[PDB]
Amino acid sequence: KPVWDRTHHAKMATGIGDPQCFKGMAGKSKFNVGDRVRIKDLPDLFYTRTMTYTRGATGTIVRLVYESPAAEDEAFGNEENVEWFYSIVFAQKDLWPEYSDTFANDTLETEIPERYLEKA
Amino acid sequence: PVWDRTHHAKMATGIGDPQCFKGMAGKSKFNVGDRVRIKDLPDLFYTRTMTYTRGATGTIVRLVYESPAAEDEAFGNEENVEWFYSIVFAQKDLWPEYSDTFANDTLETEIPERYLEKA
Amino acid sequence: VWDRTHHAKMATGIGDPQCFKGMAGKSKFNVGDRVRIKDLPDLFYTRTMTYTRGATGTIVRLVYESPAAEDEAFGNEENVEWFYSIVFAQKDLWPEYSDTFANDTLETEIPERYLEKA
Amino acid sequence: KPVWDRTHHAKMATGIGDPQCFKGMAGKSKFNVGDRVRIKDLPDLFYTRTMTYTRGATGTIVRLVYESPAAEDEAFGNEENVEWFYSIVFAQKDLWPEYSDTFANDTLETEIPERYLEKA
Amino acid sequence: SIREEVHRHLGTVALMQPALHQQTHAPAPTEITHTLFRAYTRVPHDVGGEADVPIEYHEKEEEIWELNTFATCECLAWRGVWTAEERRRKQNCDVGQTVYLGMPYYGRWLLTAARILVDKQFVTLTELHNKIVEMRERVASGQGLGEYLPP
Amino acid sequence: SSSIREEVHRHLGTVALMQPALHQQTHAPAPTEITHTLFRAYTRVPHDVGGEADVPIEYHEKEEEIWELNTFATCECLAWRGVWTAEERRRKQNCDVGQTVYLGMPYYGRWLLTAARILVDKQFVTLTELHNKIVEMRERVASGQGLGEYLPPKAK
Amino acid sequence: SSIREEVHRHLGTVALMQPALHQQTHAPAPTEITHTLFRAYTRVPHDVGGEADVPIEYHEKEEEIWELNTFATCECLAWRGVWTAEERRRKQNCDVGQTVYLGMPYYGRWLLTAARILVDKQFVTLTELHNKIVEMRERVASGQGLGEYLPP
Amino acid sequence: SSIREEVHRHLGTVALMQPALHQQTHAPAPTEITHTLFRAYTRVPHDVGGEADVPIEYHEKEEEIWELNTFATCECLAWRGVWTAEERRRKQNCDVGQTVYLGMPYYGRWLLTAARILVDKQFVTLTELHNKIVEMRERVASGQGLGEYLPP
Amino acid sequence: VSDFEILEMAVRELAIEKGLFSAEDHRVWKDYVHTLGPLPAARLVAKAWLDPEYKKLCIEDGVEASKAVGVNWVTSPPTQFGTPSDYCNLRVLADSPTLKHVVVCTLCSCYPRPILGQSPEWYRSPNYRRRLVRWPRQVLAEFGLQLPSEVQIRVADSNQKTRYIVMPVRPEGTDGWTEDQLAEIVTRDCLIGVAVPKPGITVNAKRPVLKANRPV
Amino acid sequence: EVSDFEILEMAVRELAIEKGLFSAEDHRVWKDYVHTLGPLPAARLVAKAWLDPEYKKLCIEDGVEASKAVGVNWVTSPPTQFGTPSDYCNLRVLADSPTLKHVVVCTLCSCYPRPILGQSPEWYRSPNYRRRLVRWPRQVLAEFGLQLPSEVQIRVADSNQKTRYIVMPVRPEGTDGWTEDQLAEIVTRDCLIGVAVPKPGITVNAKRPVLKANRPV
Amino acid sequence: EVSDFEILEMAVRELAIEKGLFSAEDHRVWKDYVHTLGPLPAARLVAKAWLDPEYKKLCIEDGVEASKAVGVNWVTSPPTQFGTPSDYCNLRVLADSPTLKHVVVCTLCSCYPRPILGQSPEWYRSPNYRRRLVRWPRQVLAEFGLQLPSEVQIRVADSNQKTRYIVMPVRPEGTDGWTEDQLAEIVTRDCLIGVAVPKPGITVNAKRPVLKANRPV
Amino acid sequence: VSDFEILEMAVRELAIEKGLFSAEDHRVWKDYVHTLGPLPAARLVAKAWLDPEYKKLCIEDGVEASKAVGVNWVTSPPTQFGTPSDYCNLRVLADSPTLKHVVVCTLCSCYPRPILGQSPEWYRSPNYRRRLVRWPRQVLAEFGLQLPSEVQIRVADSNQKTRYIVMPVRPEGTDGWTEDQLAEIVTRDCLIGVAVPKPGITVNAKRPVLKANRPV
Ligand SMILES: OC[C@H]1O[C@](O)(CO)[C@@H](O)[C@@H]1O
Ligand SMILES: OC[C@H]1O[C@](O)(CO)[C@@H](O)[C@@H]1O
């Protein structure tokens, strides 16, 4: 009985692109460039694209990359909700306890959807 | 995408499972007493015909009931129904090391028609 | 440095453990005695299986006299002691043994040093 | 039973040292500083102090460090034979296939008794 | 107790049983034989005939949550969310080799009950994640947690 | 020599197999044997490996198998035509497969199995149709009539 | 049966994939060694009675020429006073350690231990043993043959 | 912090679950031993240079009183001629076997080997060693203390 | 509270919130399960021993025979179409002087719940599921049961929709016994096949009991 | 010598086509598209960026728009007309500088900027590379033969969502007056990933072992 | 090709002879002795015991003395003249009865009554047999095809010291009037170990898989 | 009390009872060990930095050079023939603008105890012993040390009787410094080679410290 719509994505993104096709659907962003945010350790049962190594760490937002449904929802066919994605820069020393002070300027940049962020 | 949550209940209430599939498999391909060999069909993703039975030959002792194969039922496909047979295997035909001292030991289990071929 | 004739000179025409006969003196235990196996340190070597430690059995025979393997295996034969064949009830060794087979036993040999009156 | 001589080593090395006490006992050295040598893959059953990672590799002798019984003999109480020990330098690329050409000058220095050496 | 230490020893030495332990890190296709292919693509629940040791079988008290999980799974079937076969396939096979034997029996039942809700979209994974947070906060705040913990 | 060095490197790799360890087999332990640490580890999302300790390896390139190229195309075409989105694929392919298959099988092996999986899970084909197609395909190869671009038919 | 052979091959193969919590040990500190572990590590390797094991279809095995020669060598060494059987068992079944005890073959341990006694009691230097091994290998490679194992 | 600690515990914990083809070895036949396996099994345990290993945050470790005493005992035994350092290394870092070599602590091997040299060179019988261990345990149990480790 | 209890609560509330099933449904099922036990099956065996006609019915149509002891596989369960997991095809395996049965479900833990109750922890173990089908004589010996080598030991692997209960042969020393007396020695273990009924024995053999963290 | 993988590949493809999920034409079209992919466009973008500060600014701020300049339109170049399903349409160009050096990885899988760079390297997909780079970049880079001053900021970019990255290395010395073709030629796939830096005279990835396929394309 | 074991065997033997630890003649003499060993003498001891109640008493009380009757003097038959170094000189005969049945094992290694029974079976030396028999004798014996009444006392004998055992099973039914030769013929090696019982018509051990040697004797 | 302490007591008492060594000998060795430390080696480096002729001696004859800092490898130890385990062949490895040394003992933990003191726990680890010889650049980076790619990094594996100490290059910013000021920045780690001397840094880099159950 279950019928899957195999044309929805194409009709929506054709000539526009992904994630361009979700532009403006997230509304106003909760955070902006320069903000210091800490990664909330939300439950990761079954799926997540916010690496375990970033949980509880604080970084700096350097760019609002695009709007898109969270992978946690998109990966299960749920695209009704769209949110802002942020590119965040972490100091390596804040992720790995053993990082050497000799390489004090090393960093790691990665993207995280708004749901995982909270003001530092 | 909508899932029918009333189908099963409407079909089985007051009748039971697998009773609700009675008569849907048509004529059985095999009958009690028939010697059959178990085909080693692909077990990718799902199967309820244990690996230890593959390639072994046994004796059908009963046509237990009719039902969609588990291979289909477990993925929500119940459009096809087939006969299920209860088959008796001599233990020595399953386990190479089985002792001749216990020459009469057997193992009985159920297998849908799709896995059977005349021995 | 190593004496390679001692054993042969001592056992030829007699055999092993026959050649140690009478060297243990008087036996500390006798047939019929109930004994428990002491859990002596087993560092480096032992021929008294771990599964028997702390278990109680019945001596059914004084098999012979001989230096303990703990000493013999390291070239130390100055001391000779009595060896006893002991019978254990299977249920006293294995907690899960079935009462259906209540008469089953295990017999093995243990030198005097591991025995204490039960 | 066997009797072990517990005074031999002390009588021989007191006031002199180890390996100084074996000096001159190896005779003429088979090789000299500057020689290129390959490490023979002699059997290593039970004991050896010539690491597996050096077998079959070629290095340069940079010094004749001293004379001493080979460890293969000393470790079993056999000190009647004394031989020359050499400090050999290996290019890292000759030991590890993956070593980067970026670090082309890196080396490894270790000591090997004469018995393991053959002209390269 | 000496016997206690003896049996503890007999069980502990198994941890040290020597083996050729070959770690597998996404091997190339050329490293997969048909034998390995069949072994990797097997359905985990099919264990009949595999060699195993004797163990002193024991009974196990029922956990309150195990009772609730069982009722939840049968109720979901009763109400047509799934059939028992769909549950078996998802619970005893889809979970994979590691979880299948590493986690508890009812632990798989529970994980799979949560799985069917998400897979058939009766709840989004977000709603599940949020509910989990809610349960934890409920406990942390001291509001209790069903029959498991009083307020 | 090369022969000696090859044996040396073969040795350095072989001894890893014998690395001592406390190997605790798990046979459906009771809930009381599962700590929170173990629970989080067992319910982990397999693809999240960043930060785990690992050894240095001499990285290599690998030629693309014809079946891998075809698998890649099949997966993108299925997404192109709405059977799934890439995220649904990643979740099923890199996570749902579970720990053992995730690291025990080849990269593209997981892509392929998951392409077959999506067909069955969304009922575009019954598992019966898949099993039957595999049986027929095997016969095709065994009979000697060849298998697409993978094997030509037997000649004279 | 080809299918049956594949079935049994399968039943044996899946054992390799049995899940486990595999904890590698790399010279842990004393504080990581409990009394239970201390007893298990310092155990005498040959004492296996009572350990849980699976059922196996027991097989007979033909004697290798070298196994018969090894047996004769070990008994002759004892016959002529190089060691007593008990010294052999201790060195052969215990001193070899856990890994070799179960990883190598029965007679492989007998042979390795026969070589060991020669070296430990200094009847031969380790150097003489290493040299003899090299000579034996060269003998084989030169086409000179090797006793009753390889005709010239 | 508490989150980071849980993150790090997790990263270390999942290694226990790393998949592998785990082949238990139970005294396999000579025909199951290839030359490669023969060399690996008969290897000298202490020769680990070049083996692949992971990065670990190196730590310093506080010296145990028994470790200092063990070190002193081993150097005193060599000083007084019971053995040379090389004999110790061979017995301590190689003869102990693969399992004990990496499963037990560094100084644990030193101690076991110090006890070993006393027995192997017959300065004490194994019986004396076993009885002595019993003595130390009873000394503790009777509340008579144990050297500087436990006051009476 | 454990991670399991947290998730159980989450799943239950979510299911009810979405209207997949009601709080009452859940309560009704737990209550139904609570009533399940071995008694019905024991009585069925006792009745068969005393009524040749009923025994034949048991052997040929377990579902029909089950009604005689108050358990209707279709209507007793809350669904009125049989429990979703135990289905409605009970078969009774009758032992004889030359045949003795023992049941297992190698693929999981299929058990005749409606007439027998919940399955034992060991019955669900990978160990029992791996060994019984291949080394039944050995496993049964471990359980303390042994039969003549000439007797046919038959292992029944419940892998599809059929569930089994074993009807052991009536033991000696029970002459004149009433139905309830006979049913009293037919324990759960006898109905599985790992034990045989014996006069004076009215409870399963005592074995270790692993305690739950939060039972009752 | 057909493997279980080849058998399954045929089965899946035939079933998908028989059920009309995608056409035989779609499959051929995708394979042909993939065959046109490679690292040249990306190398060209770097060369152009080095030769035009204004284009470089564009690259840094709008990788998608800048990509059009090298013939790669992330939305319309792919057969879908909405970008490839797996690479999406949000390319970002990471510009190295005398104080910043980038290296890219996808710890969760093997996300790669296929449209402009081609197919990913075998090692890039490895659990090993994915586990270690984010934590021990200095060490992993040294293994690749790349070392930077300790004061220089090494930035590891983990493409875990819809963004794909390419690295714009600092222009090496010894290239004064070089043309666009000359510069593009030394910008290899490895330089674009970040495990290597462009060097005059080096126009191919560093040689490393090559594992052969059973039946190569 | 010769194995590492064959290379080492030759090395050890030559060194031992060269150092005069034992002679080339000693080695040949020992192999000759081994070649004369087998289960026949033990089978005859059992047959004679069944046919002579007094001899049976002797077997049960003094195995060494009883062994002389079958041409096996534990002290003087071996080349040493003090018994074999490993089997020693204390044979004990375990007499089964209607209420007692024995089975032998050596959990510590593979001690076996070689002088009167020959070389040990491969499985007898296995860690598996040595681990399980002492604890699950009923189960292991059943695997071998042997089952006894639950009331009968199954006794496992673990030869862990200098004693070696041979099992004297009860005389089976259906052998009335049988001669010594006929009775001995059905007492196989396995019967003498205890994993099987003598049966009329069965004169060889139960057939089981045979692992072939690379270079058999 | 642990199993290790019980065995340590047992071994020591037996050795003394058998006259292998005396109670006095044992205390004598422990006292000697207590006199050891990294300062002598650090002073040798400082002296070498301030005296070109002494530096030459250090490079050619470490044993003779060691006498300048009071450590005679032969007569300083209680044995009067060098310690049994460290021997009497010290070699000093001189770093330069084009050469940087780091030391390891892949076979165990051979260390120049007489002039440097006891070895670090990590130095004795299988990990350090496996990796340093093969990935020195990477391991050193972990320790926070990096050198130009063209500089020759030389790993010294002390596998025989030679023991080494590294004489690092004198760092900038120490003009006019006294021998004591220079020695002060030559830490144990600098002498091993996993670090280089730096003005203001007078102790090894802080690292986690595993506590002992019963420390000295
Ligand atoms: O004796 C061995 C002991 O250890 C186990 O095998 C595992 O814990 C136990 O059941 C047994 O009592
Ligand atoms: O790639 C295999 C590499 O790893 C080893 O087996 C172990 O470190 C090396 O010798 C080889 O170079």
Ligand SMILES: OC[C@H]1O[C@](O)(CO)[C@@H](O)[C@@H]1O
């Ligand atoms: O898709 C379900 C199948 O794939 C896995 O999850 C991963 O290989 C298997 O265990 C299961 O059989």
Ligand SMILES: OC[C@H]1O[C@](O)(CO)[C@@H](O)[C@@H]1O
């Ligand atoms: O190892 C061979 C034997 O073990 C199995 O693979 C697993 O129990 C059997 O089917 C086979 O008979």
Ligand SMILES: OC[C@H]1O[C@](O)(CO)[C@@H](O)[C@@H]1O
């Ligand atoms: O073994 C534990 C190791 O793993 C972590 O907990 C997480 O990466 C590390 O900090 C520690 O070094």
Ligand SMILES: OC[C@H]1O[C@](O)(CO)[C@@H](O)[C@@H]1O
């Ligand atoms: O099990 C390891 C065995 O080998 C040794 O370390 C060295 O011979 C022994 O003391 C120990 O018993």
Ligand SMILES: OC[C@H]1O[C@](O)(CO)[C@@H](O)[C@@H]1O
């Ligand atoms: O005595 C121990 C013997 O066995 C192995 O355990 C340990 O390395 C052998 O190398 C050694 O010779």
